[PDB]
Design an enzyme around this catalytic site. Sequence first.
Site, PDB file in Angstrom:
ATOM      1  N   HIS A  14     -12.937 -45.413  30.528  1.00 18.62           N
ATOM      2  CA  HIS A  14     -12.923 -45.061  31.941  1.00 18.62           C
ATOM      3  C   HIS A  14     -11.602 -44.451  32.374  1.00 18.62           C
ATOM      4  O   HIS A  14     -11.593 -43.511  33.179  1.00 18.62           O
ATOM      5  CB  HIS A  14     -13.210 -46.295  32.802  1.00 18.62           C
ATOM      6  CG  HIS A  14     -14.593 -46.839  32.634  1.00 18.62           C
ATOM      7  ND1 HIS A  14     -15.498 -46.899  33.672  1.00 18.62           N
ATOM      8  CD2 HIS A  14     -15.224 -47.357  31.554  1.00 18.62           C
ATOM      9  CE1 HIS A  14     -16.629 -47.426  33.237  1.00 18.62           C
ATOM     10  NE2 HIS A  14     -16.490 -47.711  31.955  1.00 18.62           N
ATOM     11  N   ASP A 117     -13.824 -44.962  40.249  1.00 18.69           N
ATOM     12  CA  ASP A 117     -14.769 -45.300  39.197  1.00 18.69           C
ATOM     13  C   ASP A 117     -15.969 -46.047  39.771  1.00 18.69           C
ATOM     14  O   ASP A 117     -15.851 -46.796  40.746  1.00 18.69           O
ATOM     15  CB  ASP A 117     -14.077 -46.155  38.133  1.00 18.69           C
ATOM     16  CG  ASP A 117     -14.963 -46.434  36.940  1.00 18.69           C
ATOM     17  OD1 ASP A 117     -15.823 -47.335  37.034  1.00 18.69           O
ATOM     18  OD2 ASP A 117     -14.800 -45.748  35.909  1.00 18.69           O
ATOM     19  N   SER A 259     -11.894 -50.505  16.119  1.00 17.56           N
ATOM     20  CA  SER A 259     -11.502 -51.909  16.185  1.00 17.56           C
ATOM     21  C   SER A 259     -12.445 -52.738  17.052  1.00 17.56           C
ATOM     22  O   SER A 259     -12.863 -53.828  16.646  1.00 17.56           O
ATOM     23  CB  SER A 259     -10.068 -52.022  16.710  1.00 17.56           C
ATOM     24  OG  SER A 259      -9.801 -51.004  17.661  1.00 17.56           O
ATOM     25  N   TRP A 318      -5.016 -47.053  10.219  1.00 21.71           N
ATOM     26  CA  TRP A 318      -5.167 -45.926  11.128  1.00 21.71           C
ATOM     27  C   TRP A 318      -5.230 -44.612  10.357  1.00 21.71           C
ATOM     28  O   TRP A 318      -4.522 -44.421   9.365  1.00 21.71           O
ATOM     29  CB  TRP A 318      -4.007 -45.892  12.126  1.00 21.71           C
ATOM     30  CG  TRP A 318      -4.076 -44.768  13.119  1.00 21.71           C
ATOM     31  CD1 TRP A 318      -4.667 -44.793  14.352  1.00 21.71           C
ATOM     32  CD2 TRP A 318      -3.525 -43.453  12.965  1.00 21.71           C
ATOM     33  NE1 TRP A 318      -4.518 -43.576  14.974  1.00 21.71           N
ATOM     34  CE2 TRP A 318      -3.822 -42.735  14.144  1.00 21.71           C
ATOM     35  CE3 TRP A 318      -2.812 -42.812  11.944  1.00 21.71           C
ATOM     36  CZ2 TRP A 318      -3.432 -41.406  14.329  1.00 21.71           C
ATOM     37  CZ3 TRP A 318      -2.425 -41.495  12.131  1.00 21.71           C
ATOM     38  CH2 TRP A 318      -2.736 -40.806  13.313  1.00 21.71           C
ATOM     39  N   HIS A 336     -20.510 -45.568  15.987  1.00 19.29           N
ATOM     40  CA  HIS A 336     -21.160 -46.442  16.955  1.00 19.29           C
ATOM     41  C   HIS A 336     -21.669 -45.721  18.199  1.00 19.29           C
ATOM     42  O   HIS A 336     -22.242 -46.377  19.074  1.00 19.29           O
ATOM     43  CB  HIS A 336     -20.185 -47.540  17.392  1.00 19.29           C
ATOM     44  CG  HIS A 336     -18.820 -47.027  17.728  1.00 19.29           C
ATOM     45  ND1 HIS A 336     -18.599 -46.082  18.708  1.00 19.29           N
ATOM     46  CD2 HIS A 336     -17.602 -47.323  17.213  1.00 19.29           C
ATOM     47  CE1 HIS A 336     -17.307 -45.820  18.785  1.00 19.29           C
ATOM     48  NE2 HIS A 336     -16.679 -46.562  17.888  1.00 19.29           N
ATOM     49  N   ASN A 340     -16.425 -41.469  23.533  1.00 21.15           N
ATOM     50  CA  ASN A 340     -15.308 -40.692  23.014  1.00 21.15           C
ATOM     51  C   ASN A 340     -15.603 -40.195  21.608  1.00 21.15           C
ATOM     52  O   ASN A 340     -15.319 -39.035  21.283  1.00 21.15           O
ATOM     53  CB  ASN A 340     -14.021 -41.515  23.037  1.00 21.15           C
ATOM     54  CG  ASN A 340     -12.842 -40.741  22.492  1.00 21.15           C
ATOM     55  OD1 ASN A 340     -12.344 -39.814  23.132  1.00 21.15           O
ATOM     56  ND2 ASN A 340     -12.408 -41.097  21.289  1.00 21.15           N
ATOM     57  N   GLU A 344     -15.783 -36.266  20.583  1.00 24.84           N
ATOM     58  CA  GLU A 344     -14.994 -35.753  19.469  1.00 24.84           C
ATOM     59  C   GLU A 344     -15.883 -35.118  18.409  1.00 24.84           C
ATOM     60  O   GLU A 344     -15.559 -34.051  17.876  1.00 24.84           O
ATOM     61  CB  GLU A 344     -14.150 -36.876  18.863  1.00 24.84           C
ATOM     62  CG  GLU A 344     -12.890 -37.177  19.660  1.00 24.84           C
ATOM     63  CD  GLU A 344     -12.060 -38.307  19.064  1.00 24.84           C
ATOM     64  OE1 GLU A 344     -12.427 -38.833  17.993  1.00 24.84           O
ATOM     65  OE2 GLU A 344     -11.035 -38.669  19.676  1.00 24.84           O
TER      66      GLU A 344
HETATM   67  O1  LIG Z   1      -7.994 -44.996  12.790  1.00 29.74           O
HETATM   68  C1  LIG Z   1      -8.194 -44.548  13.917  1.00 29.74           C
HETATM   69  C2  LIG Z   1      -9.019 -45.137  14.929  1.00 29.74           C
HETATM   70  C3  LIG Z   1      -9.142 -44.528  16.116  1.00 29.74           C
HETATM   71  N1  LIG Z   1      -8.505 -43.346  16.409  1.00 29.74           N
HETATM   72  C4  LIG Z   1      -8.652 -42.696  17.720  1.00 29.74           C
HETATM   73  O2  LIG Z   1      -8.793 -43.701  18.702  1.00 29.74           O
HETATM   74  C5  LIG Z   1      -9.924 -43.409  19.561  1.00 29.74           C
HETATM   75  C6  LIG Z   1     -11.040 -44.387  19.291  1.00 29.74           C
HETATM   76  O3  LIG Z   1     -10.506 -45.732  19.191  1.00 29.74           O
HETATM   77  P1  LIG Z   1     -11.541 -46.915  18.882  1.00 29.74           P
HETATM   78  O4  LIG Z   1     -12.597 -46.418  17.951  1.00 29.74           O
HETATM   79  O5  LIG Z   1     -10.800 -48.159  18.519  1.00 29.74           O
HETATM   80  O6  LIG Z   1     -12.214 -47.124  20.318  1.00 29.74           O
HETATM   81  P2  LIG Z   1     -13.676 -47.671  20.704  1.00 29.74           P
HETATM   82  O7  LIG Z   1     -14.573 -46.465  20.718  1.00 29.74           O
HETATM   83  O8  LIG Z   1     -14.039 -48.656  19.617  1.00 29.74           O
HETATM   84  O9  LIG Z   1     -13.547 -48.315  22.060  1.00 29.74           O
HETATM   85  C7  LIG Z   1     -10.246 -41.937  19.276  1.00 29.74           C
HETATM   86  O10 LIG Z   1      -9.462 -41.059  20.074  1.00 29.74           O
HETATM   87  C8  LIG Z   1      -9.889 -41.806  17.797  1.00 29.74           C
HETATM   88  O11 LIG Z   1      -9.549 -40.478  17.464  1.00 29.74           O
HETATM   89  C9  LIG Z   1      -7.697 -42.716  15.484  1.00 29.74           C
HETATM   90  O12 LIG Z   1      -7.114 -41.666  15.712  1.00 29.74           O
HETATM   91  N2  LIG Z   1      -7.588 -43.367  14.286  1.00 29.74           N
END
Ligand SMILES: O=c1ccn([C@@H]2O[C@H](COP(=O)(O)OP(=O)(O)O)[C@@H](O)[C@H]2O)c(=O)[nH]1
Length: 453
Positions: A14, A117, A259, A318, A336, A340, A344
């Site tokens: 958000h 929001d 994560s 990472w 998942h 985002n 991407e």
């Molecule tokens: O090893 C990693 C894990 C995540 N990301 C970046 O972190 C964001 C996603 O984080 P995460 O998957 O933890 O978020 P979630 O979708 O699980 O809330 C995106 O911009 C990814 O490009 C990254 O660059 N490297």
Amino acid sequence: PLKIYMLPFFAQGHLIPLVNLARLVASKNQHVTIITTPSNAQLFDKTIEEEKAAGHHIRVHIIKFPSAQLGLPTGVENLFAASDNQTAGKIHMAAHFVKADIEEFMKENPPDVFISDIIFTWSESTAKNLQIPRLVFNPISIFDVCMIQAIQSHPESFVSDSGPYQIHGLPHPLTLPIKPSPGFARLTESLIEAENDSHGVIVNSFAELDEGYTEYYENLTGRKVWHVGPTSLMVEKHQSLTWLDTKEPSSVLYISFGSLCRLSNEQLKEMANGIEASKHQFLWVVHGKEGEDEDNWLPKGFVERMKEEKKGMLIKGWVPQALILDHPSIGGFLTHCGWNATVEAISSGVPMVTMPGFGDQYYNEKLVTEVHRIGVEVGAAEWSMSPYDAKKTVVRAERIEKAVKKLMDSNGEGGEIRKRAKEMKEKAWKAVQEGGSSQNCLTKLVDYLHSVV
Ligand SMILES: O=c1ccn([C@@H]2O[C@H](COP(=O)(O)OP(=O)(O)O)[C@@H](O)[C@H]2O)c(=O)[nH]1
Ligand SMILES: [Cl-]
Ligand SMILES: [Cl-]
Ligand SMILES: [Cl-]
């Protein structure tokens, strides 16, 4: 120039989309203030300094996160800092507690426009009592609320104990293998309710992706949709890349769940078997497994044969995800379906293999696999409202193996999906480039706000 206050919710999916909207509106010579808490402001203050140094009138007004009222320890100010449903629910409750500090700040320094929001439900009454136009910000596609509303309005379609389930009334026929769990329609009452002289809803998506659902929503609610997204696109050597430099174009499946949506040990084992049985090359990124016996979450000697047959690479930590998704050797993205990750993947033209984990991800999956066919559906086994609850079921290995084969194999359906994914990439960048649908709509939005003030 207008005085525009922007109120993001305390969650990364958000916060960053609304911050990017703030940078876009400031770039159109408007006076934008982002209202947020100290731990969240430090996630983007360096970007704000760069925008201020470029002459853009954008600033952050700090408000105190209600840690004391919630019994939360300091520095827990967003969903990324939560580790259980109780904490996550408290961060949601924090949206109500900040009302006093924000209302006080707006009665003293009234702006021209208030953008908030969806979650801040009190913003409607705050805008009325201050006689100020308010627009709601939806940080994802408008399709999700439409899918939710179609489910809600057809309870006769979900009476059976077992699936599949048909979703009727939408531009596209949709199916669900599992029925939505109780509470699936949270945080939609503000979006589904009809218009009461509404200035519209700002949607972080683009017209081509939401096509048909935009009109469904406007017809249902009477409320105008302003598509100004994806705002992350509008505002525009690791060993993994070295390994990818040895692989053929579009030949590697990228696997990353992050994560928050990390999988269980039993699920990771089923995944490794399905991935190995798929016989396709893979780059698998796992978080939170450093210093753990691989036998607890991987089959016996999985990594040994993984490097001997030169098939896959497993990274614990990472990775530069943006560079990986842009690498020509990546031909698929198993993830998942978070918004985002979806944006991407679209921005890089990479087809997805969808394995939704919780919440809005079950709707994002359908947008990808049944509406636009820019991905392949693995098949959900459980509908979870929360990323922290352990899943009582597991996605079996054959389903993972079949979905990967369906995308990655050449002679079949994957060629179309790969081509559609590349074309959606072009449509997404066109929409945010000069003269695109989202740039035009952003200009019309600011012009409309001027005439409203
Ligand atoms: O090893 C990693 C894990 C995540 N990301 C970046 O972190 C964001 C996603 O984080 P995460 O998957 O933890 O978020 P979630 O979708 O699980 O809330 C995106 O911009 C990814 O490009 C990254 O660059 N490297
Ligand atoms: Cl975005
Ligand atoms: Cl899991
Ligand atoms: Cl247009």
